[PDB]
From a paper:
Bacterial Fluc channels are constructed as small, dual-topology dimers; the two subunits, each of ~120 residues, span the membrane in opposite orientations to form the functional complex. These channels are notable for this unusual architecture as well as for exceptionally high F-/Cl-selectivity. A Fluc homologue from an E. coli virulence plasmid, nicknamed ‘Ec2’, was used for all experiments.
In this context, Met can be viewed as a uniquely plausible non-aromatic substitute for Phe, since the electron-withdrawing sulfur is expected to produce a partial positive charge on the γ-methylene and terminal methyl groups, either of which might act as an electrostatic surrogate to coordinate F-. Remarkably, F80M results in an active flux-phenotype and displays clean single-channel recordings with near-WT conductance. We determined crystal structures of both Met mutants to test the prediction above regarding F- coordination. As with the Tyr substitute, the Met structures are virtually identical to WT, and all residues surrounding the substitutions are unmoved (Cα rmsd ~0.3 Å from WT). The Met side chains in both take on a twisted conformation, filling approximately the same space as the Phe ring in WT. As predicted, in both Met mutants F- ions are coordinated by the γ-methylenes located in nearly the same positions as the coordinating Phe ring carbons in WT, as though the substituted linear side chains attempt to mimic Phe’s aromatic ring in occupied volume and F--binding electrostatics. Also surprising is the full activity of the F80M substitution. This may be rationalized by the F--coordinating γ-methylene, whose weakly electropositive character recalls the electropositive, edge-on presentation of the Phe ring to its coordinated F- ion. The Met side-chain configuration in the F80M structure is in striking agreement with this idea, but the functional impairment of F83M, which offers a similar configuration, remains puzzling.
Author numbering:
A (entry chain A): 2 to 126
B (entry chain B): 1 to 125
C (entry chain D), D (entry chain C): 1 to 96
Amino acid sequence: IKSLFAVIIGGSVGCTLRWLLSTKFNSLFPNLPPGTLVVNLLAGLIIGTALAYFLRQPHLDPFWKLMITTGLCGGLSTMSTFSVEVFALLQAGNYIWALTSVLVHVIGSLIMTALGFFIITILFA
Amino acid sequence: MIKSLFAVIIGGSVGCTLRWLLSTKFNSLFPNLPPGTLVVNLLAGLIIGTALAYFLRQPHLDPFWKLMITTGLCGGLSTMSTFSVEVFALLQAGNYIWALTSVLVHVIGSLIMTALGFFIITILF
Amino acid sequence: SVSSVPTKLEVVAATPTSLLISWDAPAVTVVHYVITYGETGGNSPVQEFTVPGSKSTATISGLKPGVDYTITVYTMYYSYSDLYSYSSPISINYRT
Amino acid sequence: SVSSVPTKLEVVAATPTSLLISWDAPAVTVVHYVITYGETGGNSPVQEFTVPGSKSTATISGLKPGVDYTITVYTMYYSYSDLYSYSSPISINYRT
Ligand SMILES: CCCCCCCCCCO[C@@H]1O[C@H](CO)[C@@H](O[C@H]2O[C@H](CO)[C@@H](O)[C@H](O)[C@H]2O)[C@H](O)[C@H]1O
Ligand SMILES: CCCCCCCCCCO[C@@H]1O[C@H](CO)[C@@H](O[C@H]2O[C@H](CO)[C@@H](O)[C@H](O)[C@H]2O)[C@H](O)[C@H]1O
Ligand SMILES: CCCCCCCCCCO[C@@H]1O[C@H](CO)[C@@H](O[C@H]2O[C@H](CO)[C@@H](O)[C@H](O)[C@H]2O)[C@H](O)[C@H]1O
Ligand SMILES: [F-]
Ligand SMILES: [F-]
Ligand SMILES: [F-]
Ligand SMILES: [F-]
Ligand code: NA
């Protein structure tokens, strides 16, 4: 039950952030909706910084770890919205941007995870 | 905007909870391509595809239910962030074959489920 | 806030039995455009056909000479909130 | 429920000043193994080094002949719940 609250509180903050950022910004550039990109890149960054930080602090409460990763990053990021965007582009005959969206979301999200991890790893002494 | 926020939170909380339960139960069974994280992305791809086709035919549905299913449930259920750390960890572990396989199976698989969801409903109606 | 309806629908070229129409795409992911046409005098069936989202022109053939036609174009488009929905139409009258 | 501790830690080969050790990998994504070694006698300092997650063998060098060493191996591994954390060690004694 305590773990469930971490997932719900974190998840609700993440989903809310995705909803606000997506409705505000996605329509500005519909070939690669920037609201959905920014939340995936940001979640990649946070999970990477979490990866490195939680390694150095092994005695932290599993509550905070679960709220940040499964909750916040889990709620904030999305594979499903990413898929319809690409599917729609594929149906629209816009293959160049379908391919670009797949590369920028995936390669970009991994790069942000790397950045988050290595920035914290480089900070420690 | 408060009624819309409840749809996002209720849907998001159900999705995040489902991801949490399925991931902790199944991810450790096959760590090269954690099946809990895959199943939730594939399932969210399926639901958003069926939503794509279904909501097209029912244009007068409440924006509440549409928002709860897509931004809420599918948004909370799917994840790009957990997908990234899994791949990042595999890359750090020197396991490139499964890092590449995970990227292809998650992305190609999630698009295929979106297509299946869309065309199954399109073929029904 | 962004409109999914096309703008500047017009006949760019005409013969007595055909019309070449064009329009400006709306700033959304259009999957396909739906062109409709029928005789303005409302005693004849309206016909429709699709064009891909990349195209912003269409040919209408098999028309009768010297007759007023009502021509509309709407989109089937992707947006964040509505997923796949249909836009309102933009509409013009043209006499062959 | 899945153990992140390696199993069947053993010396596969030895010289007077070195040991080649091997172990079975645990069924989790191991990022690196941490090998530790020190003289079983007393409180001479324990030393450690890492080996990549793909390798399941390691060489320990610069040992003294005819001395009892305590050798341990633990993992730094990825799991869903704990992200990057350290396993418990598996341990053996060996006399050069
Ligand atoms: C590696 C990832 C694989 C994941 C699987 C994804 C499956 C993609 C489904 C594509 O959907 C089709 O796309 C065509 C092309 O966009 C559309 O053709 C439309 O456009 C064509 C030209 O662009 C015309 O020739 C067709 O008549 C017209 O229907 C067609 O309607 C649509 O159903
Ligand atoms: C797809 C788009 C790109 C996204 C961004 C890519 C980010 C990937 C980060 C990989 O991190 C490195 O992975 C190496 C393994 O791959 C590790 O090497 C370790 O393992 C090697 C052998 O596997 C040894 O040679 C090294 O000495 C040892 O440090 C190294 O520590 C680690 O920092
Ligand atoms: C897009 C990203 C851009 C930023 C890149 C900057 C990288 C700076 C760090 C240096 O790179 C690696 O750092 C690892 C440590 O962080 C070292 O691994 C060492 O330590 C690891 C554990 O910390 C072990 O897993 C490895 O086996 C061991 O070689 C590894 O040798 C070294 O090459
Ligand atoms: F998905
Ligand atoms: F996308
Ligand atoms: F992400
Ligand atoms: F993965
Ligand atoms: Na999510």
